């Protein structure tokens, strides 16, 4: 079994100059034609070209080749000692390519994904991102099936053939590679706009949809232009072609793509109107059209060495696309979701048994590690020096980053010493950050002697299934303190008498001495969630109650509420467990009417603070997991919440709705009090769950926006009443025609707490709508329903027998899906033994298939052995 090491990284024996491409789209077959111009860098060696694609012929400059074809790998042993050519002519069917990596067809339409490595399925090429070329695309096609045909860079050509066929020919002046190669031909709607850099000059923008989603485009148009304005004004980075295209396409398997000047986006992250996408759906295209943009500048412009290096554009561009959506709107907010979200998916990787660094040493197949952790804690890395540095230190840092590496492929390490550089620091310990996997884990001591606040802090860093090693880390520890009304008390700290500092933790335990204090104190840790790491200090309830009330800083506020909920479920756990009554919650519930009932607070903020960690959240660290225990605790404790203050749940409703004011239209605002409306609409129906056929009585007109209807569905998704079976039916009827919508209803059926969960989702299977090789679709209800915990852990197995079987049959066509599906399987070894019974015999029977893909192999491989 082929590992792929990054010690091993060797530069390549050939460069490709230049690569001239040609397509002749036909039926039902495309015939791809190549001439590459190469570059020997290390003379005498074979040229070795990657490719799976149908082989028709090979050419040395002109002449047949003598070459060999061995699995997936083409190799020339004579080659000249100086440039040559080398022609390939390849064959493609892109209506059998149900994997949606290469050339594929989708809504009749034809499409690209290269990222990592889906261009060897085109041509045979050296195809890794340390070569780059300069590409040009010729495409001819049928003119009534295929008007619109693009590829990256500039519309140079272009003409007819008297056979109803027409040809464009594109040049793309920059060298680029392959990865980032894109082609589109297909019937498609444009939609135009344009923007003008602050040197004058004028980007004609073109969305390309189908006719009937064109009306659904224009939020991301002017997402898109925000965010060209904001590279500029943030960053001072300008946009380099005169041309910028988006296309969306509803079969694809992740988010989107920044191949250069053409953008290939999913239909969720472009696709919005009030009436079928929430609020939170417009959030993403924001925060998605963003990315792939500010991707141009890191990961284009600047590219990635080899694939190790990944987090060096992903985890950049996440931090971008963050301070992009915070600067745009609502920025505290932002950031505690952008937390949460960390802590609830990728702690667990780090925890377990996939866990890898940010900048991994190893990987077996590339398409496993677009995760959590090189996305989300390589953004909190990148976030990190902007931490110690500022925003002047970093904006001097990404300077010298594209002054020295415009046109390049480099690594985490160039990064990191251009930050360093540009600001005369050592930042030589901070590279652990890359190469040491697993969530730091910092214990922190306060004491108050003489007028001095002594704080010590200790860190450790867990083995991990990859390197037990750990030594070490620099992480910086932002701090306050508060006196007994939770006012901001002043220190001194290295000179500087401030409210506010930022603790540097660079040894294994640190003493941090916090001078000229005057008050009797606690203090605030971690503001800001200043390093993504475990904070265990020692507060009180009335600490934390303090915190929550009355701290300035957003993170240890939501942080305060976290734990007094935490603490709530485990006393729950205990006395479930122990069989007696529940206990009061009495300071919890203190904590909780306070929040409800304090209007200077943020209303998208309020209902953060009105949010209980998930299970995944409440069982972090623990072992031999009784998956239902926990979430039966929580259940109870949501319950409590919801019975206990009904009347001011409905009250906080009708404040919602009174000012929301008939807004339905997405804005920041308008949508803080819906996300506030929804909380209280989930705790009404748990505490009245009869109330749904008053809710029902009144849909029409409770449904002015999806963000209403989605909200409702919600609330009432777990109900047991038939009515909840009828409200959905009817959504599905009313949505039939919008694929969006479609999977908002198949991540209902999936995601529900009703009892009859797996029979409902095994119909939704065979609903007219569903389609197994959608990857929305497939996500929609198979991945909603491994993630539903009391079905995908109930105690009789049927639920990992269901989700192993759906493993095992999408990795028949698209192993990408299926591989990010088996992590639902991850916990095995922490689970109680009946459980883990059987998520090991689940497991053993996917390995036990013919012909397993190498990205399920993986998996499986961590989780089982
Ligand atoms: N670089 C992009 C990765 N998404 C595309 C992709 C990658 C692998 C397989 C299929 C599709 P993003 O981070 O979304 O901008
Ligand atoms: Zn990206």
Not at 290 to 307: A, L, M, P, S
Not at 343 to 355: I, K, L, V
Not at 723 to 745: C, E, G, H, I, P
Request: charged share 25%; aromatic share 10%.
């Amino acid at each position: 079994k082929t590992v792929h090491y990054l010690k091993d990284y060797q530069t390549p024996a050939y460069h490709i100059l230049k690569t001239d491409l040609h397509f002749d789209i036909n039926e039902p077959q495309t015939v791809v034609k190549s001439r590459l111009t190469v570059e020997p860098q290390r003379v005498g060696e074979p040229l070795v070209l990657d490719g799976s694609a149908k082989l028709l012929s090979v050419k040395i400059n002109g002449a047949a080749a003598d070459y060999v074809l061995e699995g997936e790998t083409l190799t020339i042993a004579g080659v000249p000692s100086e440039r040559f050519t080398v022609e390939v002519e390849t064959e493609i069917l892109p209506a059998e390519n149900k994997s949606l990596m290469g050339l594929y067809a989708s809504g009749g339409n034809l499409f690209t994904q290269c990222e990592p490595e889906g261009f060897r399925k085109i041509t045979f090429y050296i195809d890794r991102p340390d070569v780059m070329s300069k590409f040009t695309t010729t495409i001819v096609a049928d003119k009534k099936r295929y008007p619109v045909l693009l590829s990256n860079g500039n519309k140079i050509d272009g003409g007819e053939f008297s056979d109803g066929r027409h040809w464009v020919k594109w040049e793309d002046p920059f060298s680029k590679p392959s990865y980032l190669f894109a082609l589109v031909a297909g019937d498609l709607a444009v939609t135009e706009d344009y923007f003008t850099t602050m040197s004058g000059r004028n980007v004609k923008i073109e969305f390309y949809t189908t006719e009937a989603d064109k009306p659904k485009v224009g939020f991301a148009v002017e997402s898109l232009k925000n965010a060209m304005k904001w590279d500029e004004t943030r960053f001072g980075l300008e946009y380099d072609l005169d041309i910028f295209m988006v296309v969306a396409v509803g079969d694809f398997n992740m988010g989107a793509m920044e191949n250069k000047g053409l953008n290939i986006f999913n239909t969720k992250f472009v696709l919005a109107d009030s009436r079928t996408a929430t609020d939170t759906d417009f959030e993403g295209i924001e925060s998605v059209v963003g990315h792939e943009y500010f991707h141009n500048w890191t990961g284009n412009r600047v590219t990635c060495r080899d694939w190790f290096q990944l987090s060096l554009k992903e985890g950049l561009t996440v931090f971008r696309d963050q301070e992009f959506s915070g600067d745009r709107a609502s920025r505290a907010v932002r950031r505690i979701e952008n937390i949460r979200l960390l802590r609830q998916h990728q702690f667990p990787e780090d925890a377990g048994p996939t866990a890898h660094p940010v900048r991994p040493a190893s990987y077996e197949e590339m398409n496993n590690f677009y995760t959590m952790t090189v996305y989300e804690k390589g953004a909190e890395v990148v976030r990190m020096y902007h931490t110690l540095l500022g925003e002047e230190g970093f904006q001097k840092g990404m300077k010298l980053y594209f002054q020295r590496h415009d046109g390049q492929a480099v690594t985490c390490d160039d990064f990191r010493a251009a930050m360093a550089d540009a600001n005369g620091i050592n930042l030589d310990q901070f590279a652990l950050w890359y190469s040491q996997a697993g969530t730091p884990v910092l214990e922190a001591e306060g004491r108050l002697k003489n007028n001095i606040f002594e704080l010590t802090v200790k860190q450790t860093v867990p083995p991990t299934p990859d390197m037990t090693d750990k030594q070490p880390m620099m992480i910086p520890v932002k701090v306050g303190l508060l006196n007994r009304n939770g006012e901001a008390v002043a220190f001194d700290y290295q000179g500087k008498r401030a409210t506010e500092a930022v603790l540097l933790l660079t040894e294994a335990e640190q003493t941090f001495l916090l001078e000229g204090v005057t008050e009797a104190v606690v203090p605030s840790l971690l503001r800001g969630f200043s390093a993504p790491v475990h904070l265990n200090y020692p507060y009180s309830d009335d600490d934390l109650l303090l915190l929550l009330a009355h701290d300035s800083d957003a993170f240890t506020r939501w942080e305060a509420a976290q734990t007094l909920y935490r603490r709530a479920v485990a006393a729950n756990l205990a006395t479930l467990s122990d069989g007696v009554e529940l206990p009061k919650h009495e300071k919890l519930l203190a904590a909780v009417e306070k929040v409800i009932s304090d209007d200077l607070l943020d209303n998208a903020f309020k209902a953060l603070l009105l949010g209980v960690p998930s299970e995944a959240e409440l069982w972090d660290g623990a072992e031999n997991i009784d998956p239902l225990r926990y979430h039966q605790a929580r259940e109870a404790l949501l319950d409590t919440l919801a019975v206990h203050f009904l009347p001011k749940w409905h009250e906080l409703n009708r404040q919602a709705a009174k000012q929301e004011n008939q807004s339905y239209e997405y804005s920041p605002e308008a949508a803080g009090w819906r996300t506030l409306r929804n909380v209280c609409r989930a705790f009404v129906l748990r505490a009245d769950p009869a109330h749904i056929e008053t809710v029902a009585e009144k849909y029409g007109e409770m449904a002015q926006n999806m963000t209403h209807e989605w909200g409702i569905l919600s609330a009432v998704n777990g109900n047991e009443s038939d009515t909840r079976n009828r409200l959905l039916a009817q959504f599905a009827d009313k949505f039939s025609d919008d694929a969006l919508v479609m999977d908002k209803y198949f991540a209902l059926v999936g995601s529900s707490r009703r009892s009859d969960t797996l029979q409902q989702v095994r119909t939704a299977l065979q609903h007219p709508k569903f389609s197994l090789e959608n990857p929305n679709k497939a996500r929609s209800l198979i991945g909603s329903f491994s993630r539903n915990v009391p079905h995908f852990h109930a105690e009789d197995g049927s639920g990992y027998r269901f989700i192993a079987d759906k493993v095992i049959e999408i990795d028949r066509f698209n192993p990408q899906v299926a591989a990010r599906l088996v992590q639902a399987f991850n916990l095995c070894n922490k689970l109680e033994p009946h459980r883990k019974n059987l998520v090991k015999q689940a497991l053993q029977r996917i390995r036990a298939q013919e012909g397993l893909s190498k990205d399920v192999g993986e998996i499986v491989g961590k989780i089982l052995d």
